[PDB]
Write a protein that binds this ligand. Sequence first.
Ligand SMILES: O=c1ccn([C@@H]2O[C@H](COP(=O)(O)OP(=O)(O)O)[C@@H](O)[C@H]2O)c(=O)[nH]1
Ligand SMILES: O=c1ccn([C@@H]2O[C@H](COP(=O)(O)OP(=O)(O)O)[C@@H](O)[C@H]2O)c(=O)[nH]1
Ligand SMILES: [Mn+2]
Ligand SMILES: [Mn+2]
Lengths: 392, 385
Amino acid sequence: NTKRAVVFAGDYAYIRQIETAMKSLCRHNSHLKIYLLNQDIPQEWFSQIRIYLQEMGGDLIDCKLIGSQFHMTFARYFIPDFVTEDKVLYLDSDLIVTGDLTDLFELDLGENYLAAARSCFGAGVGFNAGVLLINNKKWGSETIRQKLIDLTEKEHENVEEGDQSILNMLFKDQYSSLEDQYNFQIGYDYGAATFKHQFIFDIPLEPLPLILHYISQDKPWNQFSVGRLREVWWEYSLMDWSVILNEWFSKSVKYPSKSQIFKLQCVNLTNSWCVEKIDYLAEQLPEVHFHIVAYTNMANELLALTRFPNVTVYPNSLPMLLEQIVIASDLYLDLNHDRKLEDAYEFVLKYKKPMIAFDNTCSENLSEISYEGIYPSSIPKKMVAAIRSYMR
Amino acid sequence: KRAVVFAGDYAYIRQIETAMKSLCRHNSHLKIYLLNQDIPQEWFSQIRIYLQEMGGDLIDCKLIGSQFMTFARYFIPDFVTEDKVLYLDSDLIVTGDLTDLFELDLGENYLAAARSCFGAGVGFNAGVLLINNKKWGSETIRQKLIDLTEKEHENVEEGDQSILNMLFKDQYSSLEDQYNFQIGYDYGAATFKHQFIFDIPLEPLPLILHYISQDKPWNQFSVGRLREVWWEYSLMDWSVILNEWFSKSVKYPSKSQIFKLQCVNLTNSWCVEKIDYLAEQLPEVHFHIVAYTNMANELLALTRFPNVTVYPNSLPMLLEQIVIASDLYLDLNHDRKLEDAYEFVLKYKKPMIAFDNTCSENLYEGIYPSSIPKKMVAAIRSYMR
Ligand SMILES: O=c1ccn([C@@H]2O[C@H](COP(=O)(O)OP(=O)(O)O)[C@@H](O)[C@H]2O)c(=O)[nH]1
Ligand SMILES: O=c1ccn([C@@H]2O[C@H](COP(=O)(O)OP(=O)(O)O)[C@@H](O)[C@H]2O)c(=O)[nH]1
Ligand SMILES: [Mn+2]
Ligand SMILES: [Mn+2]
């Protein structure tokens, strides 16, 4: 069985909507490789949900939009910067999946950049951007991300529907059509009643369309709403993940969780952005939990480390808090480049913690043999091996 | 049933539900009141089922009206009927059995509370309060808290907490630190250099963990300890909590029902005759109250009922679909009647009943005494099956 690639985009403030949309998707579709573009979603949320996805034969990818090369609704531009599959389904998070999307996953795009449903049953112009079957390979080569940004830079003050207006203005005459049921814009109800489009309300709702899109500001999760099918959103919002997993498990669709308990706890205190080879070490040592502490604001280079499931980053901490982390750690990593904060060494000595360093990060005021080991920064494989020697 | 009260808004729903989960995980047969203005009824309907299966209940306390962050706890005696009640903040975690706290005799004290930050602060922390509600009610404490808050709210450093301390100085009993272990003080302690705070054992876990301050464990980043315990409960499924109790001979059937009738009314007025009474009397009926504009508080407060849906700023076509789906039109609105309703009622051959004082002055299967609305209750049940 092969994985089907799906991408959502949203901030932590929208977590209840993102999670509800994912729950509805996973309820009816297994083997999903889900990418989630975000800036501020907590790592703990990703860790747990990732286990669910894996147990259902899929995975969950934390795509952190942290850095200058990068919300609101514009994050879908950066899709080909994260997704490795040649085809992927983008979904808004103000929507609900009600059934098997196999036919949608398997649609052949040909030379079309994407496939999409029309806007509001044909009331609007062009396609609705909330459901996009995307030719990711083509998006990569045609440099679509830069083209959307550049075009949105012009004429964002000249368009009625933002990113959607931009997507239609770039892509017209080169997209495939999806049936309305794959992006059924039930959120248009207020609009339809406004413009007196009586026949919109004669469109059958039994059985439920495969994808329900609650467009507009009349969201069913608000205290009050006026559009139809409000009850469907709540049905999935209030659904335990256990219900979803139990349905798949009861049909023998069960895969082992790939999560593992940590075998070692490492700590470093930095005041600078550059912790030597930290990204590489994190990548190579998923079974080590790294704790990177600072007493001040942190640069994007360090904040972006949240994309790893095994790095905890503590900006704006204080000496008493660092001390407790040191006591709890197995090994100090002297990897920071600027002037050393001595008391960390004091904590290290006091609590009898081993400490290792790179050739270019060892203190100028310390003797070599004060470290358990000093390893070459241009061959960090050697420190990887060094770190693993502390485990058992 | 032990009475517990939380207070918070919909924006804080992730924290409220986590706190409740942690509470229910370790304590059964709880009557939970939740003071709020904007939490959706769907959330209440589902969580109420869980509380009932565990031998308790969930009460929606809607603070909707002129007489109404962080200051909702003043209104506790207006909603809570029990003589004693435990108020809890929503930025906290219950890690065990709270029986010794529930069973604490207050005597003549207005409340029991733990000291602020292990003694670092002044007076008590207001995030955990065992309240003598009978006394708060009889001595009109809510009014006094409001009045004291009118003055002095800008002379104080800790808001509602400072006011509660100011009113109840020398008239409260003490709780041990573990019933309000303010682990969220970690950043503060580290800031003011209170070194010995960090020597206090965290194992065994204190019965109540309180994440005070802006350093919340649910944020993307935080620096205080025990961050992982909050996430353990936030990510815990309700099925797990229910199974724990089911496994321990605690299991009751849900008191939920399905609606046997759908009724609808279109209104241009705040006054919909006897709608509060009808909703209360007919839980098996789902009432739909529609308006084309914003709605008065009298109508928005109907959200406290599990069987009334209110539709402010709706439109004729939207109303039409509701009317089509309805079994019976209730012409209960005072003042100007809107003809869209009569149009649809005619079109879709819908029955329509009224009170003797809400008939249109321009035209029913029945017209009932507005002074004995019980007759209408009997009549509404006559359309069912
Ligand atoms: O507060 C917000 C609002 C928007 N979104 C994201 O931006 C998308 C566009 O928002 P919306 O769906 O409301 O636009 P519409 O579908 O009405 O055109 C959403 O699906 C979310 O993924 C978000 O993450 N946080
Ligand atoms: O955005 C908010 C902030 C606060 N609260 C409520 O107000 C209480 C007091 O806030 P907090 O607990 O954060 O203050 P502290 O405990 O640090 O004094 C919380 O428990 C919540 O119940 C809320 O409902 N929404
Ligand atoms: Mn959308
Ligand atoms: Mn609190």
